[PDB]
Design a protein around this nucleic acid. Sequence first.
RNA 1: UACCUGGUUGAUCCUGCCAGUAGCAUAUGCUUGUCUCAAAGAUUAAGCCAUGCAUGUCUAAGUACGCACGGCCGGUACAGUG
Length: 50
Amino acid sequence: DDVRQYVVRKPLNKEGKKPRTKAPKIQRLVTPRVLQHKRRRIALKKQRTK
RNA sequence: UACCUGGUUGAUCCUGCCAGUAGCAUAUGCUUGUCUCAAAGAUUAAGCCAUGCAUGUCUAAGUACGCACGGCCGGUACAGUG
């Protein structure tokens, strides 16, 4: 199940302003940037072993 | 600039100190137009202190769900400034 769907968005409301629905930034989530950071560390292990 | 002068005697030559003489540091008195640099609560009390200030800090890169903002797009997890 993708946790991106189940984030409880905050239903803001105020006068003279367009409707707003804020959601928090999920922390400790596996993303293509996170995976590339583990690949970089493994590559440096190869470099200083060669 | 490697310098002396007055004072003991009726007069003399000495010993010897007193006073004079020049700088330099603190205080003080009188006087003071221009211009440059410039010390300044050490001395006595390392005594006592009203009040204000003298130490804070964010980049692309630790953590943003403050609508606090003008503004995107609207199922976009997080647009940005903060």
